[PDB]
Symmetry: C3
Subunit: 93 residues, 3 copies
Amino acid sequence: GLIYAVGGYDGNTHLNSVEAYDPERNEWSLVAPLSTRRSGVGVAVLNGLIYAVGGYDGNTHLNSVEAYDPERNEWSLVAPLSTRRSGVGVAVL
Amino acid sequence: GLIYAVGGYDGNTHLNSVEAYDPERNEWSLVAPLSTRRSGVGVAVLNGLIYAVGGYDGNTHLNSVEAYDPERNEWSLVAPLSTRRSGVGVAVL
Amino acid sequence: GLIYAVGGYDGNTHLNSVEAYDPERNEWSLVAPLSTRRSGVGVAVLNGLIYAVGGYDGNTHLNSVEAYDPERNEWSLVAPLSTRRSGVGVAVL
């Protein structure tokens, strides 16, 4: 029941930070950041984990993928994509 | 059972417009626009509302967030992110 | 139970390729590509299909929309948006 906002680009850097919105309280709070800065990142939820797929870290388009476990507040890197992808769409089916 | 397309960038302006697709009829129709133009916007659905998170309005990267109620066809602004984020990934967990 | 990564931009071209992640095996595999290269594409899942909405193909911002049927491994084009939209957010409600 939370909305997670993962990465992106502010007016100054590509972001590794992640924040979560609680609609009951109308508040966002920062949680554990990604391993890598990622804008243009695709995000999906599968088996209670949040996957962050691809993006751009300021230095290169990314093929890496990492998964967030809310029960532990940590991200871990998993198998990368076949190709670097920023501006990627992600869905779970 | 509708697909909402929120904001974006055409070949001429960043967009505040929003349109909804009905697969039964293979048609898109325009609904109420966002308060702000937003490309690179993250969108998620929680408690029957559509949240539009961050993006870019042509003038600045955005920390603002707004929520759409389909029963009223209106968007309203809620608490902003801690940081401006365009190219942000959003998921609900 | 798979995560699909649709389109995007590598360090060399806008992408029509699509790959699917199986968390049980920690592997991605390439499936049928989109009709069009699409970065900045919005993706959502409705009635067992994956919709790819808008984006950019290297030549132009896109109003086209296509839908993937995993049982047939094919994409087909459906009704386009009213407006070209890349950097578009997409959700299903």
